[PDB]
């Protein structure tokens, strides 16, 4: 499993601002939103096999290949 570091080296990510909408475009209602947020909050403070399963399943061969090529470029640059 991976875990975040203590005293993090990078804080320059500047991620996109969260969009908002009515509850029926998310899980479906306020209670359902809260329930699912609580359910998935358990996956937030580590990276492990389940995350990799999801990543593979969503990226397919195309995304896996491109990501590996870009990681090779990153390591070459470093």
């Amino acid at each position: 499993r991976f875990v975040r570091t203590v005293l993090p080296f990078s804080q320059e990510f500047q991620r996109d601002k969260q969009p908002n909408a009515q509850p029926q475009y998310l899980h479906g209602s306020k209670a359902l939103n809260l329930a699912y947020s609580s359910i998935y909050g358990s996956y937030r403070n580590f990276v492990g096999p389940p995350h990799f399963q999801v990543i593979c399943r969503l990226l397919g061969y195309q995304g896996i290949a491109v990501v590996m090529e870009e990681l090779l470029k990153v390591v070459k640059s470093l």
Partner: peptide, 28 residues
């Protein structure tokens, strides 16, 4: 470049549906 385009190229009446959508969106 894609994120820059998406940010700058944002979105841009006498339709009832539009009026109701604006009303409910403000209501949220």
């Amino acid at each position: 470049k894609g994120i820059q385009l998406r940010k700058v190229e944002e979105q841009r009446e006498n339709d009832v549906a539009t009026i109701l959508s604006r009303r409910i969106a403000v209501e949220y």
